[PDB]
Design a protein around this ligand. Structure first.
Ligand SMILES: O=C(N[C@@H](Cc1ccccc1)C(=O)N1CC(C(=O)O)C1)c1cc2cc(Cl)ccc2[nH]1
Ligand SMILES: O=C(N[C@@H](Cc1ccccc1)C(=O)N1CC(C(=O)O)C1)c1cc2cc(Cl)ccc2[nH]1
Ligand SMILES: *Cc1c(COP(=O)(O)O)cnc(C)c1O
Ligand SMILES: *Cc1c(COP(=O)(O)O)cnc(C)c1O
Ligand SMILES: CC(=O)N[C@@H]1O[C@H](CO)[C@@H](O)[C@H](O)[C@H]1O
Ligand SMILES: CC(=O)N[C@@H]1O[C@H](CO)[C@@H](O)[C@H](O)[C@H]1O
Ligand SMILES: Cn1c(=O)c2c(ncn2C)n(C)c1=O
Ligand SMILES: Cn1c(=O)c2c(ncn2C)n(C)c1=O
Ligand SMILES: Cn1c(=O)c2c(ncn2C)n(C)c1=O
Lengths: 793, 795
């Protein structure tokens, strides 16, 4: 707890746990010794917390997700346990630099983006609020791949994150479980029997989730695939890899459905294990016995990925626990709650019934029965409307039959929510109209949030300290306290101190940029940042057009006053996403021309931030002046990066989409740079018909950019390299890039104006930060606790 | 002894809490085991760091035992004993209200070996550490060791030995020493020399396991390498294909004394060799180093031919990497390497097809050719005429598909070659490699195998170790020859009663195991007749089987005739692809089922096929053995070591004058062992003449019956011709002349029975074996290797 004792513990671990001394100890060794030293501080409360849940039996919440974008654990753990300052001092006294040791830790990147990071922020919040929550996922041997740029292109490298070992995970062999696949169904007189199946074992690994300063430590249980133990002998042993390939790697797709059998196996794998583990726990507690199940258990479905949980639970209740269908179904609906995270057609999960029949025979039967009972009702309430039956069916018939997992989640759940007002609204009245009309009270909204511990206290200590010195540390657990910040809007000194914090973050992050990339950084320039997964809907392309735009204006009139900028664009593209990869090449091509043109000089620098991940977001976010949140209105369910930048002192330029809409409401629309078409404008443009060749014909600045991109100005060695981009823009652009081009650029010009007025710029910054309270994930979970899970802190 | 138990207790509770995240209410037995292991493990650290730091500071010559196998067994008790902590830990576990025996059984055996070869490496490590030698073991960290064997419907069934599933607290990853290993690619001959390009790369991640000397503060290292894919069409598939590179250290080839020319196997051999040589070279350069002193600082023992590629690999490093001239490098090489021949069985000789090698290790095939060219140029110069000698001495075999004779490469590439027992070393030197020793006489030597007295006496038989200690002191633990002092008790009946009692307690404890694992009811007063080793035709478990049946037919002949009761135990694993071995298992289990259930035989005889024979089990049945079966055909067992364990543990041996049996006889007196059957010369004479198994069948009533019973379905009614392959082998393809030794073997057994009815004489003979086993301590073997091969002294 104190410095002297932390030094002894560190040396004790370096010695007994790493078998090293100071002369032969590696940096990794020091990091592991520090990690173990901090890890020991959690054990007492972790056992105590789990024991408490058993003795008092509070209702349990289970967040079931295929993704958990956790990032690094060491610093986070030191902050939530109140050890950082002590450890920093101890390490320094041992002659080491804690910051260097921290960089050794590999990110636990078992997610793709928002969906996976949301889940991670939720666990932190649930632990901070003292809830009996458990996160359940898959312990991927490989998480989201590590990204590199070779010759301007994204190159993928396996993210072998467990290679050197993971001190934050705890194998729980006594809770191992078998998961079945294939086989056939047998309807006997003693119940239905799913037999002749292939078995794969699931070994759970527990990771502690410490709440912020509250003595609570929950658990994140991730499952690992293992071959059972019961032709060529060698091949047979090697073939054990097949089963174990189930939890081998995370599918690297963000907002896109890939119907691969292996993925279907991962979905069921995590689902079968989790539900059996929850049932066992339930039956092992202080408890026909199952009638109290929904009062003791709440399972949240993170998107439709774990949709199979609905029939799996039914399978268990009926075939194993011998409950009648009617009862089983009732308990199921009371147990599950579904969160819809997207409206993009390509992201919708539709599994071919053929694939499901072969792999999960008993589950196909259960899904069919669920649909029968479901459609019999509709037929009753609407004897005529037969087209309504087709639109609400769990099965799609057009061509090869498929299963609409989202429909399956709606009927098997008692609550369904979008992740932002505009998204939830679209989900309730448009996408699932036929369902909400019958069950209105079933649909809700639960606007996303981000944890102020990792995304403020951890990533920007300077800002957390400044805020804390002015209004106390109360805000860490109740972010709505940041509103008190309005009391200092005319405080010139607090405004200079606010600016100093940002500048320090920029100077430090600049050192990172000149170290990782050649480029020379103008530390006074404006840090224009857009970091997120590469997507056509997110429009990194639109941003790219503006950069080329600024570049030409500079070449055109070199002597014309230009507010300097450092444009940073980063994010991974799904491996099979061709257009995303091309977009990356374009950006890298532009930067090369821009960063090396003598006429532009320190006026404009462009950086493609490589390997964007949680630990990297913690560095660049505190260093940002301008946050790009420019996806086409109605395409971004919510967004969370936007919230991160808001809490850390950046201004936002974006469209009225996702949570951007709610940010404007909290801070006031004038304090954000909103632009472009809105949900209604995009629809009108659709009914009419989007003809992109019109804006190109009516906007010279855009035409120059387009011609340069099309004629090879950015790829001399390959004149037609960006042909596919141009082709999509002129004939296949569902995200209407050309349509928001003019408004975007004019918006960008106003940002530049404001940037030249420090007093005005920071004043707005302060109103934003003051208005960010709403976006703490503690508030999100609070609403989940009260309106869906019915549990208390 | 004060404050030692209390601190062990505190520490134990500290680990259960911080290391296992458990309290006394939720802890599993496995958690208690891991808690004790970490508690014991902490006592190795100080000495391990200190030991290795010392070898760095004093720079003694280092010995490197390179092997594809290390059959280590359990580490817990062994570590406690060598560190002098068993008594204190036993007491700490007890006071904590726990059953220490229950905890130790939790530990998984590190069975990274097939049999005696892998176990010898293990024993050698323990001894080298006990003698304080700067020794290092080098092998592969298999994810799956030798398979767990189960008996289903009388047949052997193999189950994957997933020994790392729950974690191994005894290994320590050393990531900073990872290394790249190359495969495939091609050879480019440029002006900058020869270059091996276009290669596929695999990484080698070493894992160090501490090897504690006995009561001397020395803690050596065993470094095992694990294969990992390097970080650098379809994304998901590409990531899944990383399993291919990792398959190289996935599982141990389960073959004992048998060459299987598989590509994966060749990859394992090169893998451990390339990782090891690079690491050894890196250590040399990091010490007070150009390479002229290498052979004076480095000695690498090649355990059999499996790591043969180490020779051309060192040449490759020396010439292609270090740029040394060929002549100089070849010189450094021979001085560095030493080869130990572990077998003369033709089916066990590694002969790789030149094509497989060219495709996988092209640069190495060129180097092997060049060594052969030089080598043969020498023969030619010494014997201008004799062209046949070239053919018999070449590393390349031409007949049909060209293959590489790895034995020959090891010989020319080494300064010393040895066998593992007088008779085998003589065979190697004068017959198999006759043309070679004639040129270099001094090169060939002998190094009689040994076993470590710590695991095979102190640990597995605490009763006998204490008995002996109360009579002649503890000195014998560090010098086994001190066992001859037991002779003073040749007349003391009191002592003989005590010796019989210890043996009795072991049989009673082991009987509990048997009846709990098998339906059979044991007669604790019966003679424990045991044959536990890998199932082989040359080891002749059949012969033994022919005796059990011969006996069965005798009891059914006169149910009232005095019969010396026996509990016959035959165990061992069969290589998955070894058809005849599996047939022999099915024949032994079938016979057993007929003898164990025959009402007329009752408590006179019981057959038990001991399932899953392995180091931990060996430690169980060995101390409980009365008679040891070591009956391999003369000239087939290069040495054997089981024989040694049994001898040291109070059992009498019935066997042929093969391997180390000859030397056991010389040491204890040929009449203090039941020797029988043909001898090497008798075997040769029978070969020259011609073996006609049918004659002995024709001339031996008791035998003819046993056979007719096997061939007609007496032991397999549902399947009358089930044992056809066995009958057909015994009659027209028996290279191990089973029947030829059947008559001698049966008469020999009757005498064993006779002697057993006489407690006083039986135990007297036993005492004579225990007092003469000192020569078979691996500490003696290692000392001899050190003086005459490695040229090093006890650091
Ligand atoms: O594995 C040991 N410590 C552990 C310490 C550790 C634990 C968890 C995460 C990181 C480090 C170790 O070095 N690793 C576990 C990792 C893996 O799974 O590969 C790497 C260890 C200490 C020790 C001390 C003695 Cl005397 C003998 C064997 C020993 N092993
Ligand atoms: O893994 C931990 N201890 C280790 C302890 C251990 C180490 C070596 C062999 C057996 C046990 C552990 O339980 N295992 C390593 C094995 C594996 O890799 O499967 C199983 C551990 C302790 C701990 C304490 C906190 Cl607060 C959080 C996470 C934690 N993990
Ligand atoms: C927060 C975060 C995201 C989510 O970003 P959006 O802009 O909301 O899409 C994605 N990736 C990482 C690494 C993050 O930290
Ligand atoms: C000693 C030992 C061997 C050796 O068997 P022999 O053929 O008797 O030399 C094989 N397996 C195990 C488990 C051993 O302990
Ligand atoms: C399928 C998917 O990854 N959806 C993503 O979910 C997160 C968390 O709700 C949203 O912020 C984001 O806008 C959306 O694209
Ligand atoms: C190739 C091989 O496994 N050889 C085996 O080695 C051991 C240890 O040297 C000998 O005792 C045994 O007789 C022999 O069969
Ligand atoms: C988002 N996304 C992908 O992630 C993707 C894709 N095609 C392949 N992938 C992987 N498409 C068309 C797409 O929009
Ligand atoms: C690496 N890479 C790509 O990833 C790529 C490409 N063209 C299209 N793509 C997606 N080219 C030319 C290329 O070198
Ligand atoms: C020892 N041995 C084997 O181990 C073996 C074999 N055939 C296959 N195997 C595996 N043969 C004929 C054999 O003698």
């Amino acid at each position: 707890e104190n410095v002297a004792e932390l030094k002894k513990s560190f040396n004790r671990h370096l010695h007994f746990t790493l078998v090293k001394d100071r002369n032969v100890a590696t940096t990794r060794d020091y990091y592991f010794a520090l990690a173990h030293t901090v890890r020991d501080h959690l054990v007492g409360r972790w056992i105590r917390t789990q024991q408490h849940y058993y003795d008092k039996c509070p209702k349990r919440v289970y967040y079931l997700s295929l993704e958990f974008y956790m990032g690094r654990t060491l610093q986070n753990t030191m902050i939530n346990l109140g050890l950082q300052n002590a450890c920093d001092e101890a390490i320094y006294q041992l002659g080491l630099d804690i910051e260097e040791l921290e960089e050794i830790e590999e990110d636990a990147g078992l997610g793709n983006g928002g969906l996976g990071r949301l889940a991670a922020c939720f666990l932190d919040s649930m632990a901070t609020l003292g809830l009996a929550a458990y996160g359940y996922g898959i312990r991927y041997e490989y998480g989201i791949f590590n990204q590199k740029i070779r010759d301007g292109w994204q190159v993928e490298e396996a993210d072998d994150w467990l290679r050197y070992g993971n001190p934050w995970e705890k194998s729980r062999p006594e809770f191992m479980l078998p998961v079945h696949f294939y086989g056939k169904v047998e309807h006997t007189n003693t119940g239905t029997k799913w037999i002749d199946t292939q078995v794969v074992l699931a070994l759970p690994y527990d990771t502690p989730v410490p709440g912020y300063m509250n003595n609570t430590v929950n658990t994140m249980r991730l499952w690992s695939a293992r071959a059972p133990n019961d032709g060529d002998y060698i091949q047979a042993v090697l073939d054990r890899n097949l089963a174990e390939n189930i939890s081998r790697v995370l599918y690297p797709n963000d907002n896109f459905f890939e119907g691969k059998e292996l993925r279907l196996k991962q979905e069921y794998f995590v689902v079968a294990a989790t539900l059996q583990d929850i049932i066992r726990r339930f039956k092992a507690s202080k408890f026909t016995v199952f009638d109290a199940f929904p009062d003791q258990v709440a399972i949240q479905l993170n998107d439709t990925h774990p949709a199979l949980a609905i029939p799996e639970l039914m399978r268990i209740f009926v075939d194993i626990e011998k409950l009648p269908w009617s009862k089983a179904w009732e308990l199921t609906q009371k147990t599950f709650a579904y969160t819809n995270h997207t409206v993009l057609p390509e992201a919708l999960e539709r599994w071919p019934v053929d694939l499901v029949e072969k792999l999960l025979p008993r589950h196909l039967e259960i899904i069919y029965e669920i649909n029968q009972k479901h459609l019999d009702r509709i037929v009753a309430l609407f004897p005529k409307d037969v087209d309504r039956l087709r639109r609400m069916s769990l099965i799609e018939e057009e061509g090869s039959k498929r299963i609409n997992m989202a429909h399956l989640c709606i009927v098997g759940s008692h609550a369904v929510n979008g992740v932002a007002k505009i998204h939830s609204d679209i989900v309730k009245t448009k996408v699932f109209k036929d369902f909400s009309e019958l069950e209105p009270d079933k649909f809700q909204n639960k606007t996303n949030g981000i944890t102020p511990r990792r995304w403020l206290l951890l990533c920007n200590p300077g800002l957390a300290e400044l805020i804390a010195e002015k209004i106390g540390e109360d805000y860490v657990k109740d972010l709505s306290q940041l509103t008190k910040l309005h009391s200092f809007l005319g405080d010139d000194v607090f405004l200079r101190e606010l600016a100093k914090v940002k500048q320090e973050n920029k100077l430090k992050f600049s050192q990172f940029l000149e170290t990782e990339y050649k480029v020379k950084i103008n530390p006074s320039s404006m840090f224009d940042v857009q970091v997120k997964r590469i997507h056509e809907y997110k429009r990194q392309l639109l941003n790219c057009l503006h950069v080329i735009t600024m570049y030409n204006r500079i070449k055109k009139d070199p002597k014309k006053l230009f507010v300097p900028r450092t444009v940073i664009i980063g994010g991974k593209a799904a491996p099979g996403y061709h257009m995303a990869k091309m977009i990356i090449k374009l950006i890298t091509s532009v930067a090369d021309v821009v960063n090396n043109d003598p006429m532009v000089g320190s006026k404009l620098k462009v950086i493609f931030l490589e390997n964007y991940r949680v630990s990297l977001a913690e560095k660049v976010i505190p260093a940002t002046d301008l946050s790009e949140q420019i996806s086409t209105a109605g395409t971004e369910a919510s967004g969370t990066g936007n919230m991160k930048f808001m809490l850390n002192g950046a201004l936002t330029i974006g469209t009225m989409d996702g949570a951007n809409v709610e940010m404007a409401e909290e801070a006031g629309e004038e304090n954000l740079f909103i632009f472009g078409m809105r949900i209604d404008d995009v629809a009108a443009l659709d009914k009419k018909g989007y003809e992109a060749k019109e804006y190109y014909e009516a906007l010279p600045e855009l035409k120059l950019v387009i011609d340069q991109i099309d004629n090879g100005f950015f790829s001399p060695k390959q004149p037609d390299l960006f042909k596919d981009i141009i082709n999509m823009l002129f004939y296949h652009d569902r995200f209407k890039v050309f349509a928001d081009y003019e408004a975007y650029v004019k918006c960008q010009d106003k940002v530049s104006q404001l940037y030249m007025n420090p007093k005005a710029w920071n004043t707005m910054v302060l109103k934003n930060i003051a208005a960010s309270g709403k976006f703490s994930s503690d508030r999100t979970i609070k609403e989940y606790a009260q309106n869906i899970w019915n549990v208390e802190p």
